[PDB]
Amino acid sequence: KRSRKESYSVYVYKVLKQVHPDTGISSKAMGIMNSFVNDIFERIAGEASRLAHYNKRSTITSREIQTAVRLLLPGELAKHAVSEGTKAVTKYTSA
Amino acid sequence: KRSRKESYSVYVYKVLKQVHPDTGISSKAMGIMNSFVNDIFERIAGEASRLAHYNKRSTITSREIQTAVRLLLPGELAKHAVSEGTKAVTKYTSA
Amino acid sequence: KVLRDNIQGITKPAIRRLARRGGVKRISGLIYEETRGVLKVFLENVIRDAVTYTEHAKRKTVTAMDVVYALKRQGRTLYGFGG
Amino acid sequence: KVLRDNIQGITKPAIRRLARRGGVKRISGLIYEETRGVLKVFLENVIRDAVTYTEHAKRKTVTAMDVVYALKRQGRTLYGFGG
Amino acid sequence: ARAKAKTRSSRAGLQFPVGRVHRLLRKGNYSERVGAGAPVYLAAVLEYLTAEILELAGNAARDNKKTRIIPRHLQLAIRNDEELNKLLGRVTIAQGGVLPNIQAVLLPK
Amino acid sequence: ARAKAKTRSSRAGLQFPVGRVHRLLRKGNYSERVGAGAPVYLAAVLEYLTAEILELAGNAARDNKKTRIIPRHLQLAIRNDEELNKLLGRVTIAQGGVLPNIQAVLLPK
Amino acid sequence: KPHRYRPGTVALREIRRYQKSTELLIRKLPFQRLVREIAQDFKTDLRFQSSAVMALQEASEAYLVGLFEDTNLAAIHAKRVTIMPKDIQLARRIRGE
Amino acid sequence: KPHRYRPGTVALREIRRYQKSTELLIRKLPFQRLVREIAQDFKTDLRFQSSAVMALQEASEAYLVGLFEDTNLAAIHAKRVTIMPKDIQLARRIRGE
DNA sequence: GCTCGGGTCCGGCACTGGAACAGGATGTATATATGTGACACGTGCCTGGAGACTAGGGAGTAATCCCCTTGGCGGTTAAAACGCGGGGGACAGCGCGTACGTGCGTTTAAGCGGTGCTAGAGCTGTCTACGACCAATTGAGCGGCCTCGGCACCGGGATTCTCCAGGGGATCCGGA
DNA sequence: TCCGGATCCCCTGGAGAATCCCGGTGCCGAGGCCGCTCAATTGGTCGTAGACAGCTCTAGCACCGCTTAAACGCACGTACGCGCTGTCCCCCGCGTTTTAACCGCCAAGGGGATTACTCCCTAGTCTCCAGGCACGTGTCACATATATACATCCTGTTCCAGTGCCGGACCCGAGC
Known part of the structure; x- marks a missing residue:
């Protein structure tokens, strides 16, 4: 066959079916979604690495991740983001 | 009893002496040079990390460092800088 | 300690001095107000970033080092403060 | 094998269509050649980095990945072609 | 005697992959040590x-x-939301176009 | 019994420290391995x-x-060079000031 | 008498027409000729994926239309409606190139 | 009858003076007072290193002076010598803030 | 017809508006003198950099293949390009009325020096929660394929936008 | 000067026309199903990074007391935005001609990508040492003051040309 190539198509597909069960996506729109999510992922990971280097900490943890999303994302998007992340941490902690 | 903070004052002071034996320096200008060298070093290092990431190389080599030198530094600065780094790595290879 | 009206703390002739450093020959009288507003917005953004850095740093004191970070991630890097 | 003049291939109506997308309803006649110039400058700036990315990859053909990297380094990052 | 292979995304109750993002952070070289x-x-x-x-x-x-x-x-969505526009001001959407906007002085009387 | 201590910067013949930059790149987490x-x-x-x-x-x-x-x-040096200005467009030097620059229309006559 | 619209009315109509639409404004094969022409100036005999050419084309049009809306704002700010090369020279100097 | 310079001559003189000089044009005490005041709205009990206050000081003069040559270019572009708030708003909107 | 005197008109002269030019005042440079602290330089040190050896693994290199890119050939037309006009916009001139510029007197608040406190910055030892490493395993995620309905294009009718050719009032000029 | 007709500007209506809207139809990417496989999972281990405790000291915070620098403020003045008008000319609208863009179709081959292999280098560990950093000290480069020296900038002064007009000349009309 071919060597496997990774993408974020199916996860965004479940996300769409949660937010709008009726509608579909174009593959061009999915290419934009992959570029977007990889872009935001590398931005937040770069901020995370930056903070972890600054405070002389060898671990990356969630605390500077809230710091990074709070500094990078503006305002209400930032505090909403902190909200779902906090509750997701609560369920992940309680397994 | 104290703990060190490292700096580039000694090296910039030395290279100032080879380029100009008869000139002085202010310490705040040396702080500006410290920020300069750290900023350029982090730019080249991050761009080198991205170049190593693109072609799936886990080892950082002088070739992509040279690539990043062409990438950031425009034209004349790039070609001369590539020249000095090339001759320098030739002496290091002979060493 | 607790203060109210320090946006007027940046005086009008100080703004004239910045304009002369910017090479402005004539300044309208209205100008100082929106320069105060733009200054407030800019300092507000960088200080929000700075207090974010220090709050992650578990410090009650704002350090210059984090201010350097906050400016340079904002694309307004400064040199000469150990950065 | 060689090409010597393709900057004239960016025709006046194409620039007019781009300006209509920019919302310009009236265009002077002197616009077209200098827009060709600034296009030439931007294209040089991006493809130099692109071919640098390519030749470091030891390839003779550029990838679209390299073009995306050239735009994201220049601060004009592109969505819709990654992957 | 192993337990049933359960997934960490379901453990959070979210759909995005915990394991994939964890692997990308491990191999993206952002730290040598990564928290859970x-x-x-x-x-x-x-x-x-x-x-x-x-x-x-x-x-x-x-x-x-x-x-x-x-x-x-996608373009009309991100350009019409203010905070996302602040997030995504310097990016270009492929095949996107722009906002429908004419300036007031460009309109006739 | 052992070779005499002789630094790598001297091997390069350069004044900047090879060892310090090497150590910074090793702990700067830019690659898992580093070339010499x-x-x-x-x-x-x-x-x-x-x-x-x-x-x-x-x-x-x-x-x-x-x-x-x-x-x-330093500010006069960086602003009067075109390529260094292109290198250093978005950085400002502390107590740097501005170039001596007046617009021609601002001058009399 | 053959009909003729007053000037600017049609121009506003292409503003609405091309601003609603997203389809690509320049001819793609002259663009490919131009990008190969500038590309061989750095290194000889490079090969292009068509997707890469279309992507760089899209980025180029985005850069042009952005500087176009800036020079539109500048030309209005100069109490005019027509853009001239000093307007775009101002726009390029303000943006930082 | 006492001496009196014509308008703009003195202004050009302090233009040359402040372009030659590098010293900070903002008084330190009210500026740091405003910095503490605004920072209080984000977090209580904040303390400041002085060098932090000066670092964000030249950040303030840098951002201001940059908007001022941008505003100067906008003003001379409109064939005028006096800036107005629409000039600064134009410069900011072209810069994209 | 001659001659002489007045009226009128133009040339030089004097009157008058505009401009080159000197001069005074002020502000900036510049020369000389003086202190002082920040830069520079010697010193103890210790720890981070260098030297030797090893395990092993990322990466260079060799083969291939095939897919993807390039080249080329024919048709069509939509796109480009060129010409005419003419009006809308660029732009310059002119008045004008304000709005900072400039200058001087005042208030005061910034600045500098000095003093006292402590809140927190920062360093150090412990150790434990936490997470990298590794064997077994699988089921979730990816590649291939298939079918279809959502959508691109086509076509006919409605609709709204544009713009110029007849009515309604207002104003201006001529006549009584 | 008032009244009445003429006329022009706005006011309106209707025709062209570009676009939106409604079906029709056929088409091809999208979603879904199926097979595969490899990366997440689970479990255990072992090391170690950070949270915490605690102590120290230092830099920031607060206060005060002078001491002027400058910010405020008023007042008079030029100059500059700016709005109107006028005038030219430049570019959009539209028509006709051209042309190469583009689909689409087919050949060919070039290098992108993959797998195997074997090895060059490098991370790691140990040991040792000298290079850079904190610290201490001194000392002349530069900040500041003061006295001249010139730049420059605005404004009074004299000069020069534009121009109205005093006097001569010429022409015209009238008297002899």
Whole structure:
């Protein structure tokens, strides 16, 4: 066959079916979604690495991740983001 | 009893002496040079990390460092800088 | 300690001095107000970033080092403060 | 094998269509050649980095990945072609 | 005698992959040591971002009476939200176009 | 019994430390492994850049008849070079000031 | 008498027409000729993926239309409606190139 | 009858003076007072290193002076010598803030 | 017809508006003198950099293949390009009325020096929660394929936008 | 000067026309199903990074007391935005001609990508040492003051040309 190539198509597909069960996506729109999510992922990971280097900490943890999303994302998007992340941490902690 | 903070004052002071034996320096200008060298070093290092990431190389080599030198530094600065780094790595290879 | 009206703390002739450093020959009288507003917005953004850095740093004191970070991630890097 | 003049291939109506997308309803006649110039400058700036990315990859053909990297380094990052 | 192979995304109750993002952080060289909860946090944030952008795009597409989302819909969605525009000011959407906007002095009397 | 201690910067013949830059790249987490010649090359290009900006500062200072370089001299050096301005467009020097620059229409007559 | 619209009315109509639409404004094969022409000036005999050419084309049009809306704002700010090369020279100097 | 310079001559003189000089044009005490005041709205009990206050000081003069040559270019572009708030708003909107 | 005197008109002269030019005042440079602290330089040190050896693994290199890119050939037309006009916009001139510029007197608040406190910055030892490493395993995620309905294009009718050719009032000029 | 007709500007209506809207139809990407496989999972281990405790000291915070620098403020003045008008000319609208863009179709081959292999280098560990950093000290480069020296800038002064007009000349009319 071919060597496997990774993408974020199916996860965004479940996300769409949660937010709008009726509608579909174009593959061009999915290419934009992959570029977007990889872009935001590398931005937040770069901020995370930056903070972890600054405070002389060898671990990356969630605390500077809230710091990074709070500094990078503006305002209400930032505090909403902190909200779902906090509750997701609560369920992940309680397994 | 104290703990060190490292700096580039000694090296910039030395290279100032080879380029100009008869000139002085202010310490705040040396702080500006410290920020300069750290900023350029982090730019080249991050761009080198991205170049190593693109072609799936886990080892950082002088070739992509040279690539990043062409990438950031425009034209004349790039070609001369590539020249000095090339001759320098030739002496290091002979060493 | 607790203060109210320090946006007027940046005086009008100080703004004239910045304009002369910017090479402005004539300044309208209205100008100082929106320069105060733009200054407030800019300092507000960088200080929000700075207090974010220090709050992650578990410090009650704002350090210059984090201010350097906050400016340079904002694309307004400064040199000469150990950065 | 060689090409010597393709900057004239960016025709006046194409620039007019781009300006209509920019919302310009009236265009002077002197616009077209200098827009060709600034296009030439931007294209040089991006493809130099692109071919640098390519030749470091030891390839003779550029990838679209390299073009995306050239735009994201220049601060004009592109969505819709990654992957 | 192993337990049933359960997934960490379901453990968070989110859809974005915990293991994939964790592996990308391990191999993206952002730290030598990675905490457990940070990929869960990041996956939740990214899933919410995708959810809200897809909500805006779907609302625009239903406004544009198209039942499949378009890059044009993505552009019109992100350019019409102020805070996302602050996030995404310096990016270009492929095949996107721009906001319909004419200046007031350009309009006739 | 053992070779005499002789540094790698001398092997390069450069003043910037090979070992310090090597250690910084090893703990800067830019790659899992590091080539030997890469920090040598990086120290070389850094020393060339610092060198040329030092002659620029030196002759700018000598034009002001001061033997010690000033941040004003550094700003005059970086702003009067086109390629260094392109390198350093978005950075401002502390106590740097501005170039002596008046618009021609602002002058009388 | 053959009909003729007053000037600017049609121009506003292409503003609405091309601003609603997203389809690509320049001819793609002259663009490919131009990008190969500038590309061989750095290194000889490079090969292009068509997707890469279309992507770089899209980025180029985005850069042009962005500087177009800036010079539109500048030309209005100069109490005019027609853009002239000093307007775009101002726009390029303000943006930082 | 006493001396009196014509308008703009003195202004050009302090233009040359402040372009030659590098010293900070903002008084330190009210500026740091405003910095503490605004920072209080984000977090209580904040303390400041002085060098932090000066670092964000030259950040303030840098951002201001940059908007001022941008505003100067906008003003001379409109064939005028006096700036107005629409000039600064134009410069900011072109810069994209 | 001659001659002489007045009226009128133009040339030089004097009157008058405009401009080159000198001069005073002020502000900036510049020369000389003086202190002082920040830069520079010697010193103890210790720890981070260098030297030797090893395990092993990322990466260079060799083969291939096939897919993807390039080249080329024919048709069509939509796109480009060129010409005419003419009006809308660029732009310059002119008045004008304000709105900072400039200058001087005042208030005061910034700045500098000095003093006292402590809140927190920062360093150090412990150790434990936490997470990298590794064997077994699988089921979730990716590649391939298939079918279809959502959508691109086509075509006919409605609709709204544009713009110029007849009515309604207002105003201006001529006549009584 | 008032009244009445003429006329022009606005006011309106209707025709062209570009676009939106409604079906029709056929088409091809999207979603769904199926097979595969490899990366997440689970479990255990072992090391170690950070949270915490605690102590120290230092830099920031607060206060006060002078001491002027400058910010405020008023007042008079030029100059500059700016709005109107006028005038030219430049570019959009539209028509006709050209042309190469583009689809689409087919050949060919070039290098992108993959797998195997084997090895060059490098991370790691140990040991040792000298290079850079904190610290201490001194000392001349530069900041500041003061006295001249010139730049420059605005404004009074004299000069020069534009021009109205005093006097001569010429022409015209009238008297002899």
